[PDB]
Design an enzyme around this catalytic site. Structure first.
Site, PDB file in Angstrom:
ATOM      1  NE  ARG A 143      -4.043  -0.055   1.780  1.00  0.00           N
ATOM      2  CZ  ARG A 143      -5.151   0.165   1.079  1.00  0.00           C
ATOM      3  NH1 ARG A 143      -5.457   1.392   0.670  1.00  0.00           N
ATOM      4  NH2 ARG A 143      -5.954  -0.849   0.788  1.00  0.00           N
ATOM      5  CD  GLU A 180      -7.282   2.369   6.445  1.00  0.00           C
ATOM      6  OE1 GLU A 180      -7.884   1.953   5.429  1.00  0.00           O
ATOM      7  OE2 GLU A 180      -6.238   1.838   6.883  1.00  0.00           O
TER       8      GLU A 180
HETATM    9  N1  XAX Z   1     -13.259   5.996  16.779  1.00  0.00           N
HETATM   10  C1  XAX Z   1     -12.474   5.256  15.963  1.00  0.00           C
HETATM   11  N2  XAX Z   1     -12.494   5.518  14.630  1.00  0.00           N
HETATM   12  C2  XAX Z   1     -11.734   4.812  13.760  1.00  0.00           C
HETATM   13  C3  XAX Z   1     -10.866   3.745  14.273  1.00  0.00           C
HETATM   14  C4  XAX Z   1     -10.888   3.505  15.729  1.00  0.00           C
HETATM   15  O1  XAX Z   1     -10.181   2.616  16.244  1.00  0.00           O
HETATM   16  N3  XAX Z   1     -11.691   4.279  16.497  1.00  0.00           N
HETATM   17  N4  XAX Z   1     -10.054   2.995  13.340  1.00  0.00           N
HETATM   18  C5  XAX Z   1     -10.124   3.193  12.020  1.00  0.00           C
HETATM   19  C6  XAX Z   1      -9.664   2.243  11.205  1.00  0.00           C
HETATM   20  S1  XAX Z   1      -8.062   1.762  11.202  1.00  0.00           S
HETATM   21 MO1  XAX Z   1      -7.751   0.069   9.627  1.00  0.00          MO
HETATM   22  O2  XAX Z   1      -7.416  -0.925   7.853  1.00  0.00           O
HETATM   23  O3  XAX Z   1      -7.633  -1.416  10.456  1.00  0.00           O
HETATM   24  S2  XAX Z   1      -5.706   0.219   9.667  1.00  0.00           S
HETATM   25  S3  XAX Z   1     -10.019   0.495   9.336  1.00  0.00           S
HETATM   26  C7  XAX Z   1     -10.533   1.680  10.377  1.00  0.00           C
HETATM   27  C8  XAX Z   1     -11.906   2.139  10.456  1.00  0.00           C
HETATM   28  C9  XAX Z   1     -12.881   1.230  10.540  1.00  0.00           C
HETATM   29  O4  XAX Z   1     -14.235   1.542  10.132  1.00  0.00           O
HETATM   30  P1  XAX Z   1     -14.658   1.368   8.596  1.00  0.00           P
HETATM   31  O5  XAX Z   1     -14.240   2.690   7.993  1.00  0.00           O
HETATM   32  O6  XAX Z   1     -13.860   0.185   8.098  1.00  0.00           O
HETATM   33  O7  XAX Z   1     -16.146   1.125   8.686  1.00  0.00           O
HETATM   34  O8  XAX Z   1     -12.166   3.545  10.695  1.00  0.00           O
HETATM   35  C10 XAX Z   1     -11.128   4.187  11.456  1.00  0.00           C
HETATM   36  N5  XAX Z   1     -11.751   5.073  12.434  1.00  0.00           N
HETATM   37  N1  LIG Z   2      -6.292  -1.120   5.524  1.00  0.00           N
HETATM   38  C1  LIG Z   2      -5.985  -2.307   5.010  1.00  0.00           C
HETATM   39  N2  LIG Z   2      -5.945  -3.388   5.813  1.00  0.00           N
HETATM   40  C2  LIG Z   2      -5.636  -4.605   5.325  1.00  0.00           C
HETATM   41  N3  LIG Z   2      -5.606  -5.659   6.158  1.00  0.00           N
HETATM   42  C3  LIG Z   2      -5.303  -6.868   5.707  1.00  0.00           C
HETATM   43  C4  LIG Z   2      -5.009  -7.056   4.357  1.00  0.00           C
HETATM   44  C5  LIG Z   2      -4.657  -8.451   3.844  1.00  0.00           C
HETATM   45  O1  LIG Z   2      -3.812  -8.604   2.964  1.00  0.00           O
HETATM   46  N4  LIG Z   2      -5.031  -6.011   3.508  1.00  0.00           N
HETATM   47  C6  LIG Z   2      -5.339  -4.783   3.965  1.00  0.00           C
HETATM   48  C7  LIG Z   2      -5.368  -3.684   3.103  1.00  0.00           C
HETATM   49  O2  LIG Z   2      -5.115  -3.806   1.904  1.00  0.00           O
HETATM   50  N5  LIG Z   2      -5.697  -2.426   3.634  1.00  0.00           N
END
Ligand code: XAX
Ligand SMILES: Nc1nc2ncc(CO)nc2c(=O)[nH]1
Ligand SMILES: Cc1cc2nc3c(=O)[nH]c(=O)nc-3n(C[C@H](O)[C@H](O)[C@H](O)COP(=O)(O)OP(=O)(O)OC[C@H]3O[C@@H](n4cnc5c(N)ncnc54)[C@H](O)[C@@H]3O)c2cc1C
Ligand code: FES
Ligand code: FES
Ligand SMILES: [Ba+2]
Lengths: 760, 450
Positions: free
Chosen positions: A309, A713
């Site tokens: 990435r 993100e």
């Molecule tokens: N409050 C709060 N918001 C947060 C997070 C959190 O821990 N707390 N974490 C993220 C991460 S970090 Mo990642 O690929 O695992 S690296 S995905 C992800 C994330 C998860 O929520 P979706 O967008 O997938 O629905 O939003 C963000 N907003």
């Molecule tokens: N944010 C993010 N998380 C991931 N976690 C696992 C894996 C597994 O390969 N890929 C990803 C990815 O591409 N982006």
């Protein structure tokens, strides 16, 4: 309900203190408590291990070695193995060697330190140059992607800018630390844990105990923050818990103490980025040449996709005709680095953002203008592609930046800072604008799937269950909104239920910002199946077409007659029609070759820009963000409120990464910053004194859930504008290139001040 | 050994068998699960609870607070913030309105901190909530909540606790302690407990022979001597900062950036001195302003300049059975300045702590009192730098010329906080900063307007 600024699903429960987290859940009087016995050497063989004083220690019921593990001893999300308990040797200071099961959390932690371990130490591979020099790496060589010919482009460039800089790692510091609980339940176990990936927990615990998957059930209601830190680091605790629960016959709970947490678990991959960027006389980029040296730690974990990435985002926001990355994923005798909001994305983007800033300064043009000139073309004979060959046809950045600069007062303020700077000699102000282009989707294609399960009960009320996990991002609230929107009911009628591997199986990690994206779709599918069933029933009963039955505002309408939702459901129940449906979604259009770095890994990109202003003390390096302005594209937002919050928070976290948060290892690989008194996340007053966030509201080109965009993100990368502004403040101190390193601590800022000043 | 206290409006009596058990432990063992453990170290404020007594009401860290300290007080936790009937606090409602919670884990601590701020009608939210770390929200929504809640009348059910009350040694008077500590020299004296509680929670130590000084009124007094101010060892940092507002705005300025609000409410000046820390911030300030320390041993009473109390790294001028009683600061100290340097501004430990205090005979330097923290193994003055400064003109070039002598005064350390190079540079940077701030030049980055 979709598009309303509604509050978080447990907002009141939070505010009252009634929201349960893992350590809060009540459990049987006999629940044992677990603690790891950690390694004190960075790289050694274990010659002797005396656990006698550990067993004699009060309250201890069981002590475990790797040899005491039935079946598997692996917690790696990689195909390659990573032991839960050390096997004859240690690979970093803080590696679990043994497991203590005591009658109290305190008793176990006390017992954990009482061991007598003799080591035969080897040379450790602690620094990047060492790993590079000793060939300590993953994948057996560096991954290299090339688009066009950089070497030839940079040779005949009108303006060239070479350089190199360090970007430090980052500890997640989720307030609720790692936590798990195993409950032996007749031949199988039930796991409760603070995890982003309950399906992998199931997968791991099952192998650990030597049980089929249908014998392990994981439930997970909420996290106290995850940020990627709970995508795989949870495995160790759940394995330890199930293993000890199996052996002691009673329930087992494990939670890291804050100091154990930081020593044991992985962090954000710290990178070194060497760059060679070039442009022509007009200012268009001719080529950019990157080398990524990434610190992975002792084990693979999720380094492979992370550095992929970083490479995928090495274009930043700009079209480069010739671009090459050389990505070394280096093995070190340190913590096994892992996922963290952005997932390598910020690291690669920053490499591009530092290089383009350098080039800008090198030829003496306003960086904003040079960045503007080099964005991808707006939509509307051939569309530009990324270096990995994906077409960029949703690029709003040009217009977005133009909007943001008007509302942030960019041209006036920038001139006002110039004058203010020449009034002071102890203080300097800086301002910068940073763009974000972030690809949405798992780069590992097959993980782009989600599932849901929806129940309508005879009183009309709904029970909603999906694959995604709540870590604070307002995911459940969004799904409730989607559900209530599709069924045509008040969101009050929809109740969210804890994430359950026995309810929705084979789920992916709640990552890649795809949580709301794919689960949104999955929920919609389950509801449309249910709405269809009810519409079909009414249409038959009322004599007409199913599509002529309107579901809106808790009312159903067909043939000029109108009932309440409950009335129709009850009647459909009496009619013997199923009020239960599964939903499922897979992201389309995705196909790419990792090895050649070609194809379409992403469905769409998310855009945004931030203008940050800062002050620096030229004597000490002390500094603070005075004002921030953000315009972020959330698409057709599912929840305006929740989305602003995500942007607000991700910015502060992104800025904090590049400013005051700093990881430090000693000469022996002992992590010296393992507490909140040595690791400094942004505190209350660290917030922008003027904090302006506004959503760029335009539907997504791709067919996503109500044309929204993944807002999890992408905004984290907006923190780059703070590091760029900090550099701008330093550039205002003299003729030389400041060469500010990440993080930009008071020390690191003062160094960059004195370089521009030219003070040895 | 049984103590009583008001727990969320209801009276409670408790047998103390383990004197060292923290309030956080007890609350969670009781089932009062709303108080979260965030780190067990003081830095994050996730365990913030609200205590009340005769002195008023304040938010403190539950994890640093040991049970025998809440004896006789009224304690209020998150599950007690809302009304008996069920109505939410103006603070709680506003936080729901203004999206102040995301993951929700730090929310209980914040609510408690805000409610206590609401009860005392305090609006300096930056310094108040500095102790409460949040990782999700970016703080902006929490400020909106706090301001929106500020317009509302105080929670009367919270104020109803003010009616209340009106193994381990707990002294009543200073004489009582002097008696006991003389008989038990090897004892662990616990005042604020913000250092001592880290030996049990983090260092996993056990403390026998324990006495709590936070119940001695006469030891915690600010009195006016006909030559300065007698500040007892029991006086809390918050209260010391509160008093300094007037006479010594320089010390009050520094003490603002001393720990967090929740630590300042219980952490004391006698404990800060008696901890004998090189990175301690109390000593360098008082040494620069020429303050004396007073030690007590039964009926015996020694007095000295504060800098002399600190002999070597982890070594003080303390006799067996001798305790820190008080400090004396002179009425005025106009030339005093306080420079704390650290990675983050709020809630941090100093890398270098510069404290400069010059007096002038109109253009020329009379006395040089320049003291440093985190520069040596002990908080000490810059001897060679001070001596070279006396007789000189008070101008940048002269001070700049004497800067090399600081490299003879100290040989600083390199750790996770700062390199020796930077520490040395910062000490020299603070001297130029002192001349500039006194000449009316803009120097402080915290004072800058957005
Ligand atoms: N409050 C709060 N918001 C947060 C997070 C959190 O821990 N707390 N974490 C993220 C991460 S970090 Mo990642 O690929 O695992 S690296 S995905 C992800 C994330 C998860 O929520 P979706 O967008 O997938 O629905 O939003 C963000 N907003
Ligand atoms: N944010 C993010 N998380 C991931 N976690 C696992 C894996 C597994 O390969 N890929 C990803 C990815 O591409 N982006
Ligand atoms: C989150 C946090 C932030 C902090 N930030 C700072 C900071 O910014 N600057 C700074 O200087 N310190 C800081 N500290 C540590 C600081 O030393 C203490 O918080 C406080 O100043 C000491 O007061 P106390 O009463 O709590 O000491 P205690 O913990 O009660 O005692 C500390 C030591 O002094 C002894 N002692 C206490 N009272 C007496 C007495 N009357 N006579 C003799 N001996 C006594 C005790 O036996 C013990 O050995 C911080 C601590 C925490 C937990
Ligand atoms: S637990 Fe972090 S301060 Fe009490
Ligand atoms: S709200 Fe998630 S930590 Fe503060
Ligand atoms: Ba971590």
């Amino acid at each position: 309900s979709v598009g309303k600024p509604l509050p978080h699903d447990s907002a009141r429960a939070h505010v009252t203190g009634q929201a349960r987290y893992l350590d809060d859940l009540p459990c049987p009087a006999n629940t044992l408590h677990l603690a790891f016995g950690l390694s004190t050497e960075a790289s050694a063989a274990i010659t002797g291990l005396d656990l006698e004083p550990v067993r004699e220690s009060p309250g201890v019921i069981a002590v475990f070695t790797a040899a005491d593990l039935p079946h598997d001893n692996d917690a790696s999300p990689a195909p390659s193995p990573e032991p839960v308990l050390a096997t004859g040797e240690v690979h970093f200071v803080g590696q679990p060697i043994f497991l203590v099961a005591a009658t109290s959390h305190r008793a176990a932690r006390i017992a954990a330190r009482k061991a007598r371990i003799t080591y035969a130490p080897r040379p450790a591979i602690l620094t990047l140059d060492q790993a590079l020099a000793a060939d300590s790496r993953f994948e057996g060589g560096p991954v290299i992607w090339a688009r066009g010919d950089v070497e030839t482009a940079l040779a005949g460039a009108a303006h060239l800018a070479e350089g190199c800089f360090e970007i430090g790692g980052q500890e997640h510091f989720y307030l609720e630390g790692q936590a798990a609980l195993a409950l032996p339940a007749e031949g199988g176990v039930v796991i409760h844990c603070s995890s982003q990936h309950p399906s992998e927990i199931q997968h791991k615990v099952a192998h650990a105990l030597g049980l089929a998957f249908h014998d392990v059930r994981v439930e997970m209601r909420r996290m106290g923050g995850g940020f990627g830190g709970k995508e795989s680091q949870g495995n160790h605790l759940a394995i330890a818990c199930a293993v000890a629960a199996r052996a002691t016959g009673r329930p087992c709970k494990m939670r890291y103490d804050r100091d154990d947490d930081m020593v044991i678990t992985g962090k954000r991959h710290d990178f070194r980025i060497r760059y060679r960027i070039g442009a022509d006389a007009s200012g268009k980029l001719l080529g950019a040449d990157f080398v990524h040296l990434a610190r992975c730690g002792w084990s693979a974990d999720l380094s492979l996709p992370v550095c992929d990435r970083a490479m995928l985002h090495a274009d930043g926001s700009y079209f480069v005709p010739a671009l090459r990355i050389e990505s070394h994923r280096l093995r070190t005798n340190t913590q096994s680095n892992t996922a963290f909001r952005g997932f390598g994305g910020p690291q690669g983007a920053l490499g591009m953002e530092r290089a383009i800033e350098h080039l800008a300064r090198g030829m003496g043009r306003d960086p904003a203008e040079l960045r503007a000139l080099n964005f991808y073309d707006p939509p509307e004979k051939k569309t530009q592609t990324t270096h990995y060959g994906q077409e960029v046809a949703d690029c709003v950045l040009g217009e977005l930046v133009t909007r943001l600069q008007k509302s942030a007062n960019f041209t006036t303020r920038r001139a006002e800072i110039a004058a203010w700077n020449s009034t002071n000699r102890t203080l300097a102000r800086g301002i910068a604008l940073s763009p974000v282009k972030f690809g949405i989707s798992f780069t590992l294609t097959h993980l782009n799937q989600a599932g849901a399960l929806v129940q309508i009960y005879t009183d009309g009320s709904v029970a909603l269950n999906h694959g995604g996990t709540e870590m604070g991002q307002g995911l459940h609230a969004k799904m409730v909104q989607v559900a209530a929107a599709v069924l045509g009911i008040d969101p009050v009628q929809v109740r969210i239920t804890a994430t359950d591997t026995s309810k929705v199986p084979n789920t992916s990690a709640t990552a890649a910002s795809s949580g709301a994206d794919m689960n949104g779709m999955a929920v919609k599918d389950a509801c449309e199946t249910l709405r269809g069933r009810l519409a079909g029933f009414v249409a038959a009963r009322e004599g007409c077409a199913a599509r002529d039955v309107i579901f809106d505002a808790g009312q159903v309408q067909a043939s000029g007659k109108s009932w309440r939702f409950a009335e129709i459901v009850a009647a459909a129940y009496m009619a013997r029609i199923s009020l239960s449906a599964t939903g499922f979604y897979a992201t389309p259009k995705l196909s790419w070759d990792r090895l050649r770095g070609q194809g379409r890994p992403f469905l769409y990109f998310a855009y945004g820009a931030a203008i940050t202003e800062v002050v620096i003390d030229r004597l000490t390096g002390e500094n603070r963000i005075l004002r921030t302005d953000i315009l972020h594209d959330a698409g057709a937002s599912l929840n305006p409120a929740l989305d602003i919050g995500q942007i607000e928070g991700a910015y502060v976290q992104g800025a904090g990464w590049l400013t005051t948060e700093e990881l430090v290892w000693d000469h022996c690989g002992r992590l010296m910053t393992h507490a909140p008194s040595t690791y400094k996340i942004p505190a209350f007053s660290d917030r922008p004194r003027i904090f302006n966030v506004a959503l760029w509201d335009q539907p997504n080109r791709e067919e996503t859930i109500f044309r929204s965009k993944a807002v999890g993100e992408p905004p984290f990368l907006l923190g780059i504008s703070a590091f760029l502004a900090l550099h701008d403040a330093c550039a205002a101190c003299g003729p030389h290139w400041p060469d500010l390193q990440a993080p930009a601590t008071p020390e690191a800022v003062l160094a960059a001040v004195r370089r521009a000043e030219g003070r040895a | 050994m049984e103590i009583a206290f008001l727990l969320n409006g209801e009276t409670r009596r408790v047998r103390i068998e383990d004197p060292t058990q923290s309030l956080l432990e007890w609350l969670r063992a009781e089932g009062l699960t709303g108080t979260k453990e965030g780190c067990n170290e003081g830095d994050c404020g996730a365990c913030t609870v609200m205590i009340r007594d005769a002195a008023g009401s304040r938010a403190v860290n539950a994890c640093l607070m040991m049970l025998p300290q809440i004896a006789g007080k009224a304690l209020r936790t998150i599950e007690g913030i809302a009304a008996p009937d069920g109505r939410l606090h103006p603070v709680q409602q506003a936080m729901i309105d203004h999206h102040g919670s995301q993951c929700g884990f730090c929310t209980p601590g914040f609510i408690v901190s805000m409610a206590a701020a609401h009860d005392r009608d305090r609006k300096d939210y930056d310094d108040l909530l500095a102790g409460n770390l949040c990782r999700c929200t970016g703080y902006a929504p929490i400020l909106r909540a706090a301001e929106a809640a500020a317009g509302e009348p105080p929670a009367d059910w919270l104020q109803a606790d003010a009616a209340f009350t009106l193994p381990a040694f707990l002294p009543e008077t200073s004489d009582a302690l002097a008696d006991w500590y003389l008989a038990h020299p090897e004892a662990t004296l616990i005042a604020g407990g913000t250092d001592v509680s880290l030996w049990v929670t983090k260092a996993l130590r056990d403390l026998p022979e324990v006495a709590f000084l936070s119940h001695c009124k006469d030891l915690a007094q600010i009195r006016e001597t006909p030559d300065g101010y007698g500040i007892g060892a029991g006086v809390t940092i918050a209260a010391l900062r509160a008093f300094a507002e007037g006479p010594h705005p320089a010390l009050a300025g520094l003490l603002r950036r001393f720990a967090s609000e929740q630590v300042r409410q219980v952490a004391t000046i006698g404990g800060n001195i008696a901890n004998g820390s090189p990175i301690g911030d109390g000593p360098p300030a008082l040494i620069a302003m020429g303050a004396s320390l007073t030690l007590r041993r039964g009926q015996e009473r020694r007095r000295m300049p504060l800098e002399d109390f600190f002999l070597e790294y982890r070594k003080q001028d303390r006799r067996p059975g001798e305790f820190v009683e008080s400090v004396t600061l002179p009425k005025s100290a106009p030339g005093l300045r306080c420079y704390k340097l650290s990675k983050r501004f709020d809630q941090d430990i100093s890398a270098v702590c510069g404290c400069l205090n010059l007096t002038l005979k109109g253009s020329k330097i009379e006395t040089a009192r320049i003291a440093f923290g985190g520069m040596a193994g002990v908080p000490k003055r810059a001897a060679a730098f001070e001596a070279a400064l006396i007789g000189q003109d008070f101008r940048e070039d002269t001070i700049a010329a004497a800067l090399p002598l600081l490299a003879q005064d100290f040989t600083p350390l390199s750790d996770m906080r700062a390199s020796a190079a930077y520490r040395m540079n910062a000490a020299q940077a603070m001297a130029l900063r002192y001349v500039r701030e006194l000449s009316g030049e803009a120097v402080a980055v915290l004072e800058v307007m957005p």
